């Protein structure tokens with residue numbers, strides 16, 4: 428099994444399509460840069476998972492709701508920036524900055540947290556979490572964007588040791604990353620995937 432085939436069996440086809448469109452906009456070829464493609468799929472899925480089930484009620488409070496209720500039509504606690512094309516990503520960042528008064532980032536982050544009122548940059552790494560954290564922090568002299576890094580081995584590091592989410596939501600993400608690593612190993616793709624990451 429090539430990595431390209433694994434990606435299509437491992438990830439939901441909507442994620443694969445959003446990831447493919449992002450790669451093309453980002454200028455890379457999914458059929459060549461197969462480890463990048465897997466990484467983008469993984470990161471995007473992690474961005475979706477971070478946001479799942481978290482909402483702001485009509486009383487302005489952050490609550491959790493796992494039942495996919497047909498009447499549950501509340502404002503999401505997070506807005507997702509990743510997966511949108513640049514035009515639409517800036518449209519959303521602009522709206523957020525208007526609606527909330529928060530400082531506009533110079534780089535597109537991945538998420539906005541309506542409770543904490545801050546952008547979030549997500550990192551998913553096969554390397555060491557601390558070094559990836561520093562790389563991100565360096566790359567975005569912003570200082571107002573919260574950084575949250577996950578590794579496939581279950582480590583995490585976030586700005587000021589503030590992990591934003593409850594432990595169970597993070598464990599949900601960590602379980603999906605455990606699974607991806609486990610399944611890659613079984614098809615002998617993990618070693619390649621892990622060494623392929625670069626700064």
Ligand SMILES: O=c1ccn([C@@H]2O[C@H](COP(=O)(O)O)[C@@H](O)[C@H]2O)c(=O)[nH]1
Nearest residue numbers: 453455463466467470509537549550551
């Ligand atoms: O121009 C870009 C931006 C992002 N990415 C990839 O998209 C994923 C998410 O990026 P980030 O939101 O953590 O920057 C990473 O796998 C990163 O390498 C690219 O390949 N090119």
Ligand SMILES: [Mn+2]
Nearest residue numbers: 509535536537
């Ligand atoms: Mn991003």
Ligand SMILES: [Mn+2]
Nearest residue numbers: 537548549550
């Ligand atoms: Mn990110």
